Design a protein around this ligand. Sequence first.
Ligand code: GDP
Ligand code: MN
Ligand code: NA
Ligand code: NA
Length: 365
Amino acid sequence: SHGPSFIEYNGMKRDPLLDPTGEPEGHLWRADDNDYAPNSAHSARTNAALISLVRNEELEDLISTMKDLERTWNSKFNYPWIFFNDKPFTEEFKKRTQAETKAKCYYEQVPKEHWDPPEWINMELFRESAAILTEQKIQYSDKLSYHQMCRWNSGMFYKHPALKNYKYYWRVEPKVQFFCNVDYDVFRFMEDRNLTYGFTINLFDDPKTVPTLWPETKKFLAANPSYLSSNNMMGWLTDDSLRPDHTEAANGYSTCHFWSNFEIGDLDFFRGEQYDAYFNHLDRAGGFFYERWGDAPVHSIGLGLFADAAKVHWFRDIGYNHIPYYNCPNSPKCSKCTPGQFYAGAPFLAKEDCRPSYFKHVGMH
Ligand SMILES: Nc1nc2c(ncn2[C@@H]2O[C@H](COP(=O)(O)OP(=O)(O)O)[C@@H](O)[C@H]2O)c(=O)[nH]1
Ligand SMILES: [Mn+2]
Ligand code: NA
Ligand code: NA
């Protein structure tokens, strides 16, 4: 039912999001019988934050997103917002953001050492490969800042001092929508089940952004054979049954990834020996700059090799949109999205859904 449709892979045959979609099983922490007051010193909140790497110029789009996340979820639970930026935030940014939430807002700068390219990266080599990707890649002109952002999300956010006493994060981007009321504490849902990571959307990537990522990953694994987990996602990571030309073009990696603009995650996974050694290996290989390795494929590969796949969760009940893709469940808690409609735009977008592979090789849990 959740298998691939062919006409040429053409997306999912029958989207599970069409099924009546409710809450996960087990105990859930509710706002109506706990202390989730925004300024309570004895609240039911665990050590978690809503986080966002964002620019001053994206303020209006950030505010739209905050309104959705607050209305659907955080107005009841009042977890803090922590904003990150390589540059200082304006006073207008601080005032407008704090006005949209009863929770505490924090405003952090990314340190130069977590943002600047490392000393070993040759900037002339960067510029040469960037010019080629600019020429080849659809609706894409290269920016150094994009590479710095990918590297920051891949290896640096979990090392920021502001997050030292936090264990869980919910990553948020500007200009995204949330469609469904969520009536349980998602962070304590994660914590009580020892979950590592949560996603809403699962996509193919552009192989041109990651051609040596899998080769470099295999090198890392050969040097560290004890790191591979037993409940791993090798089948999903190496799948070639849906779009074999992607897997060939990315030299053994399917290119499928959790779409990282949305993430609910355990910071201590990424801080761990295995993942962080993987990041440092990739950092020294140079592909964050000489290629355009996204944090999504890097997170996805790291999770798929080093996490317990049983501890990765599809948040099917969180209605979500970052242009042009959707996770819209069939639930009376949702409005303003079409259940099971994966994309908005041209029909060639349908083939970008990788869930039929993920659900086959890993599952729908
Ligand atoms: N502070 C800062 N944030 C950035 C920069 N580049 C990207 N971002 C943020 O990183 C996330 C991803 O960037 P975005 O432009 O949405 O890329 P896309 O979602 O892949 O198109 C968003 O939350 C952006 O606000 C940057 O140079 N500085
Ligand atoms: Mn974005
Ligand atoms: Na309450
Ligand atoms: Na281009």
